[PDB]
Amino acid sequence: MNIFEMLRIDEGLRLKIYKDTEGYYTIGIGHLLTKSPSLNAAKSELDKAIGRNCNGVITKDEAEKLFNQDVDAAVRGILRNAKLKPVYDSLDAVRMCALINMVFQMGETGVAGFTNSLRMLQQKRWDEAAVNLAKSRWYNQTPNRAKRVITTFRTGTWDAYKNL
Ligand SMILES: [Cl-]
Numbered sequence: 001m002n003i004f005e006m007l008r009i010d011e012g013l014r015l016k017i018y019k020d021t022e023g024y025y026t027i028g029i030g031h032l033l034t035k036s037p038s039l040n041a042a043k044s045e046l047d048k049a050i051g052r053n054c055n056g057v058i059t060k061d062e063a064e065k066l067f068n069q070d071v072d073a074a075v076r077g078i079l080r081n082a083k084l085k086p087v088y089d090s091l092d093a094v095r096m097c098a099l100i101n102m103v104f105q106m107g108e109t110g111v112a113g114f115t116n117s118l119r120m121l122q123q124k125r126w127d128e129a130a131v132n133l134a135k136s137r138w139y140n141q142t143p144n145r146a147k148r149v150i151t152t153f154r155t156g157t158w159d160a161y162k163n164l
């Protein structure tokens with residue numbers, strides 16, 4: 001399993017503009033277009049991102065391109081962040097994926113706010129971090145995805161993504 005497959009499973013793939021769990025206009029594999037309530041703002045952002053007149057629809061190759069760009073940016077965002085980088089560098093390869101997953105979903109800023117969970121992951125107190133990670137709006141709003149990610153941090157295995 002790898003980060004791309006992990007996120008493909010958590011975000012799904014949709015070739016027409018849709019609303020995410022928060023009601024924000026999104027497309028492809030979890031690519032957020034705008035937090036604005038206007039569908040035209042979204043269609044505007046979309047064409048701008050793809051570089052052609054899409055009218056709300058994209059191809060699978062286009063969705064995959066946005067996906068690569070997005071994974072890349074999440075990674076870089078972690079490397080640039082003083083609170084994130086040290087944690088990420090301390091993690092094994094499976095667990096790094098869990099951190100990338102969070103940043104992809106909630107942004108750098110959002111994840112960097114998980115101060116105590118972050119310190120616990122750094123110290124490798126897996127069970128403790130899992131419980132702390134659970135005391136969040138994230139877990140309460142998107143419990144199934146949060147459980148998969150937390151299970152990943154807790155075990156360092158892909159068990160939670162097996163059979164999906
Ligand atoms: Cl809570």
Ligand SMILES: [Cl-]
Pocket residue numbers: 141142143144145146
């Ligand atoms: Cl969920």
